[model samples]
Target: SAEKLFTPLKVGAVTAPNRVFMAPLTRLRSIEPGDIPTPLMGEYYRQRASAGLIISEATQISAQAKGYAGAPGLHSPEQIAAWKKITAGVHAEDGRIAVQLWHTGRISHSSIQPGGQAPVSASALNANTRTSLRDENGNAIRVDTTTPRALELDEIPGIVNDFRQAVANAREAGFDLVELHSAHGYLLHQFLSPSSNQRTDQYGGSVENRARLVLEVVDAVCNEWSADRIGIRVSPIGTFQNVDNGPNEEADALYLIEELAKRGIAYLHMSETDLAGGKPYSEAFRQKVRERFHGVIIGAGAYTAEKAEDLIGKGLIDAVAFGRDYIANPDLVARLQKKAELNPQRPESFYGGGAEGYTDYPSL
Candidate 1:
């Protein structure tokens, strides 16, 4: 039958019962003011606890790191305590979960920043991206992002420290593992790309310097917990948030990936785009990545059961991360096991919603 997908595999510090991991899709359901996770959030995750692994939505590491309004935070005691309940909820069902620490960087507007201030990035520039913020009436609406100010060289350490603190808070929140949101043109990705990072300091120009901040943050977090429980997400060719990594992006990614492998981290979570276009990771590139990194590589994109089976069976990827599909199917692993029908997700109910399209999905 579906033995390959159902077989338990050890990812980082935890063992997953299947090869399908749930992607960290942001739903923007946190309470306002403090962005504290609600008990309803616990129910939402508890419904999808059947996945091999569950990665939480991109969670802000600090107030300055927040770009979206409803995303949860890991800095405050209240936020950590609220997430503790959610983690406990998942553990109660014997499910494994990890927190995706995030810093949206320049992909934000003054409307979402503290004191209506500008957001910070590796370089001062504007990304061709839009962000959603709350209106005066509490309605969520999307708007173009504002240009961001580059972080001062002296302030770089502070940013790295933010990640270190977030890692400590995640441990206290009962997370079995931790993932850094380094991709999708976030703060870390901003530094990585040539189009974004045009600095003349030690943190820019070359791939090594550009990767330094993220690696430092990684090392800082690794100091708190073993590297075995740490993971980093990257979008090598991703143009989201107007990243435009361009041709050299792949070479830079290889350098970073090799460094991560050298650190003995848990896994490399690659957020592959353009799956709908059928332009997935090329075999040569995938093999090159596999050869460079000794640990696991979790390939993510629009995936079907048959494609996942094909990739894993062919030894192209260690596992797969399912995003939208998991939103509408709580028992995705079970359904995949039997090749059963799946419920279509309601995109309208994806962001800023109650439990209608969230926990209402039934499991067969």
Candidate 2:
């Protein structure tokens, strides 16, 4: 009586109830100062227990990794305890979950660190977007990130250590899986971008050289987690911070994904390049990526169930991830499978506030 959508899936040591999975969501509603996960987050995830798996929103690894004011962290013992509650709650409901250990890299501001920190990058150059540094009352604190210090060659091991320590914290908190967030124009991506990584060292040069940073990070993560229990998210064509789209060119991001595959990463999450919207030039690159990576691939970006089903039917992708749809419709998996109507997302109160849109979405 089971259909493909309802079929059991093996991602590492865990078995998901179905093929549908929840995307990593940065809802920005953690308890302040401590930046701990609250009971409200439990309810937010509880509403979507039907998902085969839920990869949580980004949780920073340390102060330098802090991407914004309200983002939560897994760097401290207190943070581990708070998140343990969340993972326990999810497990108690018979749900599977993964934690995204994140670092914003150059996307950070010094004002947010333990005692006014400095944002670190592969190179000294900074991006255009303003960092989210705020006061105690949540007022937007203006802090220029002009003096971002690039991580010295000797200092990179420390960054790698932060990732390893973060993974240890994730397992201590009882996550079924661990995902390294390297996408969305963050630290790892910055290294891949020639615009951000101006290093003449081993980490920069050609496409293969650019992939060195990503592969190195993957190597550290794989050390903590099994090849099957570990996954990664990458946006090869995104312009979040307007960083390198790769010398203004390259085939897909296969140059990066192929190198990642060598480490045997369990899954690779790919952000789409719009083609039907008259941006079809990257189709060859997209196919190249899908063909080269030998593991299960999850497709993200503006995907509807029909489109997802179509992709899977054609054997192009393994699963689909939704952002806005998951916010308004907690029961997205069910709604999609049954062809039900989706709830409209309220974008007004989407960030840095109470749990109205965060956890108040109806499951029905």
Candidate 3:
């Protein structure tokens, strides 16, 4: 039985009713020009309120942080107002929500960047991956990521401030928590991984140096709000956007985890390598992570109800975040409890669509 999955657990300042947390998935349906969340989007999130904790899709902290067309943002007043409605909708359904703040870094196309300029990263390198863009008819299309210019030392503080402001915006938007998207080989991950960062400055070379920017961002956000209201997602071993943790992947991850634990943050959302078609994290490595991080650990990867229960029973993770399954199952927790069949996800309407594959999913 999935009895353990239904137990209420404390996740920082908020308590989740069940362990079936919804993973942040980008369904690029935000209104254009302002990158604002729409009422339809609010309806979509409201439909999935049964999730223990609904983490919003990765939202850009600024216009410069945008990587995919039609993705939402939390920077401007208009965007903030739009998100307020969405957050209210979630709350009305008794659903707790968190905003996943993001900066795409080199995983961006020049067309999506402000002034059509190249994206920014820790070093002058291309992610060598493709990102989504909207066509004339608003269809999602893939394009090659542009080579980014290395961020100037002086500009680092500005990035930190952007995060601070976003955290404030998240609060103003009535979100229960804020999640830093330092995973999926985004901007923060670019700085942490040696494969993307090859600088001679203080933000490069050793593991501590590479982790400097992430820590600084965390400090700045913590100053705005308590650390208990914040969570961080990390893909330590998963190589995304052609970025990895280099030779000492596990060591780098453990060091960062230890630091995060010391800060007394809310939770660590571990996006496993298996999510990206790589080997799953070994049991030994998971044990090491548990030893280092004393806070809540949310595991996301190819997890079924039984697998999630097994992991939780073994004390490897406190919660499980379902990604693709959440797309078709709005009442995922109930479905898991009853072992009900889930609706098949429509790949064609997965991104940049209206309500077709979004809020139209059936519920039992």
Candidate 4:
């Protein structure tokens, strides 16, 4: 018996045919003028239909939630229609896909925000990174992000509703489920980390206060869809995108995980490792998370098939999500099953291209 990796799994309301899942990857190929999904996106996803579950790239929940110039959105009617095409394509091949609702928060340039407005966050702090936006000549230019304005207490409810509306739109788009992008120092995760959240109101201060906004957003989305059809991605010890979940925020992760676990959400996708390199959240920390959350735990951090099998066999993680591997191999599941040599991804062709490295990879 192949113990766990190849076994069927009932993830949320959808039953995953196997344990190898696809991680949400930002390819930056969404159509321009409105950052809309294109038929190219549909074709790209349809080729990777063999994944047990496909989590789509981060899609902004509102116009104000956008941070990048080329990523797609789910706020407008046109965007929803575009996503419907992609979802229909994935479903046509009997593949299960979920949409990730996201808000980039302080990690943004004014060129991408609505009406050239500054990005908003838990506090007026700026992330230590740069964001790229399309210039007047339609050229991508790198620029440092401006300091964001902290959201007023009165304005918080509207942001929560944005997430709720996104869930409704995802249902309209024919997605099997939805995942909140509460990771990598995004809007929701920013609120959860003490380093980014420096408010004195009820939404900040202690661990519970830091976790308030994210939990509220989750509750708001739950109103639109069943908890079983909703999942959340979290970066427990992530340090990318100018995020610093330092030792002080360690309690933030523990408290948030406990609260979400008690709510009986679909699954918890914990980003404990990164291909770029960083101290992992640790096997000890994962064991701690396992005790708190009783549902599925999808471990993401550049995992291989054999490592995934071993981790699943040991009961450390429920499933392993592949990011770069899936990007390089549309038939990643088949390759893993047969232990085939994988096709390496051409890093240069990952973004803003026709179809060089996207759907052109050969599947054996």
Winning model by lDDT: 3
Worst 10 residues of 1 by lDDT: 273-282
Number of residue pairs clashing in candidate 2, backbone atoms closer than 3 angstroms, sequence gap of 3 or more or interchain: 1
Per-residue lDDT over 255-361 for candidate 2, one digit per residue giving the tens place of the 0 to 100 score? 67778788777788876542223233244665677788877788877777777676767667777777778888888888877777888889865666777667777
Identify the runs in model 4 with alpha carbons over 4 angstroms from their true place: 1-3, 135-139
Q: How far is candidate 3 from the true structure (C-alpha RMSD, Å)?
A: 0.9
Q: After superposition, how far is residue 89 of candidate 4 from its true place, in Å?
A: 0.8
* Higher-scoring candidate on TM-score, 2 or 3: 3
What's the lDDT for candidate 1?
A: 0.88
Q: Judge candidate 2 at residue 150 and give its lDDT.
A: 82
Ranking by lDDT: 3, 1, 4, 2
Tell me the whole-model lDDT of each prediction, alpha carbons only.
0.88, 0.76, 0.92, 0.86
RMSD of each: 1.4, 2.7, 0.9, 1.6
Candidate 4 lDDT by residue in tens digits, 1-364:
3446778898988999889999998877777878899888899999998899999999999999988877899989899999999999999999999998899999898777788888999999989788767667655566898789899999999999999999999999999999999998889988888789899999988878888988998888777788888899998676766677757656667888899987788899988755578775567777888889977889888776777887788788889889889889999888888777899879876655567788888888
Residue-level lDDT tens digits of model 3 in 1-364: 5679999999999999999999999999998888999999999999999899999999999999999998999999999999999999999999999999999999999998899999999999888889999999988899999999999999999999999999999999999999999998999999999989998999999999999999999989988999999999999986765787789898889999999988899999999964457878889999999999988999998888888998999999999999889998898888999988899988788789898989988899
**Where is model 3 more than 4 Å wrong at Cα?**
none
Model 1 steric clash pairs: none
